[PDB]
Design a protein around this nucleic acid. Structure first.
Lengths: 113, 85, 200, 122, 94
RNA sequence: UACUCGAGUGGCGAACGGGUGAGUAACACGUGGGUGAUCUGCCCUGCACUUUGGGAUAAGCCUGGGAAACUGGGUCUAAUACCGAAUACACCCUGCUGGUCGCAUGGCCUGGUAGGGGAAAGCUUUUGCGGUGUGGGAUGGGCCCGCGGCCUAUCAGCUUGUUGGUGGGGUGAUGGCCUACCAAGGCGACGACGGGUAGCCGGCCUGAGAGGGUGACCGGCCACACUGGGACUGAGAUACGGCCCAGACUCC
């Protein structure tokens, strides 16, 4: 069975997953047909990067996702874009970019008075 | 064995083996009858046995005892033998 | 680990006085040991090794780490020597020393390792922390009123400050414009004999 | 040579001689001292150099030097054999190392104790 | 609103098989010729170009090509063992 | 009774995952291709259906044999278990026939036409689950081939299903894969056949690089599962924790 999966990567207490598509008969850390996203749940917003077009291809040709990646697709709206229930939600929230070190540098220079 | 599922699958596999055995044996019997009718030279008897044996080969392929491609090759051989007769 | 032994004797073996304040070497010139003032066979290997050890013991870096610094410099572009000096100067013990908060790299190492500093908000107990462009090195709230930093702010006119660095506050916040070039380094040493050593 | 000479016959590196074959790829071996004795070195040197014929676990009987001042070794002693060339002794390539469960450390070593199995005294 | 009774497969382009120009060196088997192939490639180390002479066995089905004939072959499936080529045409018959 | 569930029937999984590197110098591996010579459960998506009838049996009950493992019998019960039949006209086979592609066998037009055939399983009230045939897709494979990567000629002749062909068989599929017959060829100094060693690769170590060495972790492929052989079941089997036999070893 072709399936969307999470391949674990990363060090011991840093489970950075890579969202792949692979047969169910493979192994977790094994050969992947295609990589379509990544999933880093150590961020508080717990990064959910994905590739929507290829996700839609593999779902259309019948790749049964796992439960976690199903939830991720529900977040990104690709599950909903596939079935069509609320069109495409777009529930995704990203980590806000912290201020630039140059901006901090100039701010502290200004404070240096 | 030492696992429940295999202990059961032994019985199941023996059952399916007996089934497929009976079926394939019937098929080989039909084919030897057909080939006897042909090498003797009878024609209408051979055609009737051909229809019957093709039916049984389709049937076994549907049951899964054999592959449909195998059934096809067998019955094709029968038909061509009958034709060239 | 680190070298917690006498400091003057390394400078004596290596000629250059890294810190200063002794009279034995400064009246009689000699490396340490009973066999000071001995006859020397003037080998290029000793020259090179002596510059490498000059760097090692001027900073607080051991060989298994200095080797990594050399390798980083050799891989990354430009001149391996000034890249290596840039690395050795772009570490926390050295930047606070050059900023004058400690007046000794040993003292700066003790301060950073004991956590009397931090960088961009997060505490740092790593003297080998490679600082970068646009780095605010704050001092924590106990440390600013502690005695060593009182001494820093009191005697912050003895040794100069590099250009790539500047202190900005009476609380002794430190800022990094960029990383130093060989003119900015200001260290009593070449940098070619060391790369020759590690190319041997 | 010519290029065609090379593509035909090719270059063959001189075969490096397998060394310490009695170890059989191991760094060390265990062996019973079959005969502890003493040998006389080559002509320029003269001394009574301590050795042992040891039957290793590799099914090989070899001569092995016994470094250090003293040694408590008799026959039937379990000994740990390393490599190491002893020049003055011609027909020997192996040494014995202390801390072998029989070969205790050398007495009163105080400089290079690690090479002679001597514990620190404090 | 029904879908098609029959859905066609895609127009997969037919693969390109291998084509070998060669010289016959045997015709003594039935419907089978042996052919020499000259593949010249550089040495992996010394760089010289090595004229290598390889033999293959092909199928003619009519027995027209004999010894010394320049021919063209197309790879095929196994027609026998050792035999994965078909004749196409003869070029410099001799 | 029917929440729940031992045991049992049945389905699915058990072939993945996990281990080792003994064997293997080979299409095993790597890489690139071919398959007009092929399979593909589950999954997805289209089309058409899911009709009808029957016979048992496990389990249970009553027994018997055996030390045990286990097993024989009688009686009884159901099914998505099993078995017949109808329909299928998409599919399979054969005959005739058209067009087209052609890379030759041949392939495509679900070509047309004629004949003969091929199936199904129901359950539950709930975010409901299913079953059969067929088209397509996806995935996972199989088979074939080019090239590449050890030592050895103090191993030079090897081969008789071995090289090819025809007709049959067999396969999922091409093919001496197998067989009858026929022809006598095929491989070899560009190193056949032998001997030795060895799992292969990405990679790793070194090195200025070329190269040399290596094949640990990690990842991919292969092979193997006490030794040897064999098939069965199944979509799929080297079937580790499955079967049969033989053998060694251990135990009752």
């Amino acid at each position: 069975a072709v399936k969307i999966k999470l391949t674990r990567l990363g060090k011991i207490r840093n489970p950075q997953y890579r969202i792949i598509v692979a047969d169910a008969r493979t192994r977790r850390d094994g050969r992947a047909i295609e990589v379509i996203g990544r999933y880093h749940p150590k961020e508080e917003p717990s990064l959910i990067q994905i590739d929507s077009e290829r996700a839609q291809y593999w779902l259309g040709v019948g790749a049964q996702p796992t439960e976690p990646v199903l939830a991720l697709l529900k977040i990104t709206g690709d599950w909903q874009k596939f079935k069509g229930l609320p069109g495409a939600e777009g529930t995704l929230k990203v980590k806000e970019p912290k201020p630039s070190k140059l901006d901090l540098f100039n701010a502290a220079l200004a404070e240096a008075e | 064995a030492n696992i429940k599922s295999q202990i059961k699958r032994i019985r199941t596999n023996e059952r399916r083996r007996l089934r497929n055995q009976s079926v394939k044996s019937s098929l080989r019997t039909a084919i030897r009858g057909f080939r006897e009718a042909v090498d003797a030279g009878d024609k209408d008897k051979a055609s009737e046995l051909l229809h019957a044996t093709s039916r049984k080969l389709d049937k076994a392929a549907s049951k899964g005892v054999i592959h449909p491609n195998q059934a096809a090759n067998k019955k094709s051989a029968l038909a061509l033998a009958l034709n060239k007769l | 680990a680190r070298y917690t032994g006498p400091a003057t004797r390394k400078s004596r073996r290596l000629g250059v006085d890294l810190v200063g304040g002794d009279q034995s070497f400064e009246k009689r010139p000699y490396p340490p040991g009973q066999h000071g003032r001995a006859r020397i066979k003037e080998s290029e290997y000793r020259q090179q090794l002596q510059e490498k050890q000059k760097a090692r013991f001027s900073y607080g870096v051991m060989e298994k780490q200095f080797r990594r610094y050399y390798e980083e410099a050799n891989r990354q572009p430009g001149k391996t020597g000034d890249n290596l000096l840039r690395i050795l100067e772009s570490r926390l013990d050295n930047v606070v020393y050059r900023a004058g908060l400690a007046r000794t790299r040993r003292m700066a190492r003790q301060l950073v390792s004991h956590g009397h500093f931090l960088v961009n908000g997060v505490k740092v107990d790593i003297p080998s922390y490679r600082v970068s462009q646009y780095d605010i090195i704050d001092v924590k709230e106990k440390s600013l009123n502690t005695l060593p930093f009182q001494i820093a702010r009191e005697t912050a006119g003895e040794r100069p400050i590099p250009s790539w660095l500047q202190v900005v506050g009476e609380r002794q916040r430190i800022l990094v414009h960029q990383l130093p070039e060989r003119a900015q380094i200001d260290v009593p040493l070449t940098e070619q004999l060391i790369v020759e050593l590690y190319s041997k | 040579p010519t290029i065609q000479q090379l593509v035909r016959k090719g270059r063959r590196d001189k075969i490096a001689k397998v060394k310490t074959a009695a170890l059989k790829g191991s760094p060390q071996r265990r062996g019973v001292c079959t005969r502890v004795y003493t040998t006389t070195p080559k002509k320029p040197n003269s001394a009574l150099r301590k050795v042992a014929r040891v039957k290793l676990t590799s099914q090989v009987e070899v001569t092995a030097y016994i470094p250090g001042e003293g040694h408590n070794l008799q026959e039937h002693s379990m000994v740990l054999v390393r490599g190491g060339r002893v020049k003055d002794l011609p027909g020997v390539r192996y040494k014995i190392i202390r801390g072998s469960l029989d070969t205790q450390g050398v007495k009163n070593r105080k400089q290079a104790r690690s090479r002679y199995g001597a514990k620190k005294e404090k | 609103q029904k879908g098609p009774k029959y859905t066609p497969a895609a127009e997969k382009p037919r693969g390109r098989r291998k084509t070998a120009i060669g010289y016959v060196v045997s015709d003594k088997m039935q419907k089978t010729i042996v052919v020499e192939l000259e593949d010249r490639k550089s040495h992996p180390l010394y760089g010289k170009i090595i004229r290598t002479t390889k033999k293959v066995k092909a199928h003619d089905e009519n027995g027209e090509a004999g010894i010394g004939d320049r021919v063209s072959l197309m790879e095929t499936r196994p027609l026998s063992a050792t035999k994965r080529w078909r004749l196409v045409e003869i070029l410099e018959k001799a």
